[PDB]
Amino acid sequence: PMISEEREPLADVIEKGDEIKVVAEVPGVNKEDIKVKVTNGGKKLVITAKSEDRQYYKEIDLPAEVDEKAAKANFKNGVLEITLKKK
Amino acid sequence: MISEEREPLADVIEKGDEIKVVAEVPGVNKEDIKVKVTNGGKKLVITAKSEDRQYYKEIDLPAEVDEKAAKANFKNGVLEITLKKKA
């Protein structure tokens, strides 16, 4: 349908020194529905999810420059776990 | 590792015979969820437990509902349950 609601999801950051872990609650979307892009040289993170049920958008400022190269993604029961390696 | 119980986002919508209650409880597996009906028709009680996240919610229903009746479904961290109004 034409009209949708866009929410800002709950997210948290864990700065283990080696890794940066981002966890977001995005219930109501499938994994395929989710897109993450690192921006600003790995300074920043963006999350977009759209599903018939839900719409989510998030901007996150990371502690350190990070690289997409080793990055991994987990989605369980509506919670998204992302781990990135700092550059 | 500190536990705090949380109150889930819930929307209750009633159409016709049915009352549909929607709850977001991400983090939690479906077997870790408990749904029960109390105080005759009026109130619906939801319990979700997992190590990382725990939820409890109680909802006062617009109309009394039979406890036994239900259709319930879980998807991507979202719980949808369908309730029948008392005859």
**Residue A28: which of B28, B29, B76 has the nearest Cβ?**
B76
Enter the tokens of residue A25.
């609650």
CATH architecture of B1-87: Sandwich (2.60)
Contact B76 A79 (CB under 8 A): no
Distances (CA, A) of B31 to A47, A56, B28, B34, B74: 29, 27, 8, 8, 10
Q: How many helices (H) and strands (E) does chain B have?
A: 0, 8
Enter the tokens of residue B61.
């229903």
Method for this entry = X-ray
Q: How many residues does chain B have?
A: 87
Cα angle vertex B27, ends B13, B53, to 5°? 100
For residues A47 and A36, give the distance between their C-alpha atoms in angstroms, rounded to a whole number. Answer: 5
Handedness of CA A57, B33, B56, A15 (dihedral sign): negative
E strands within chain A? 6-7, 10-14, 19-25, 34-39, 44-50, 55-61, 66-76, 79-86
**Residue A25: which of B26, B29, B75 has the nearest Cβ?**
B26
Q: How many CB atoms lie within 10 A of CB A22?
A: 20
Give the strands of the sheet with B43-49, arranged side by side: B5-6, B54-60, B43-49, B33-38
Task: Please give, rounded to a whole number of angstroms, the shortest distance from the CA of A75 to a CA of chain B.
Answer: 9
**In this structure, which amino acid lies at residue A28?**
G
Question: Is B4 within 8 Å of chain A by CB?
Answer: no
**Residue A30: which of B26, B27, B76 has the nearest Cβ?**
B76
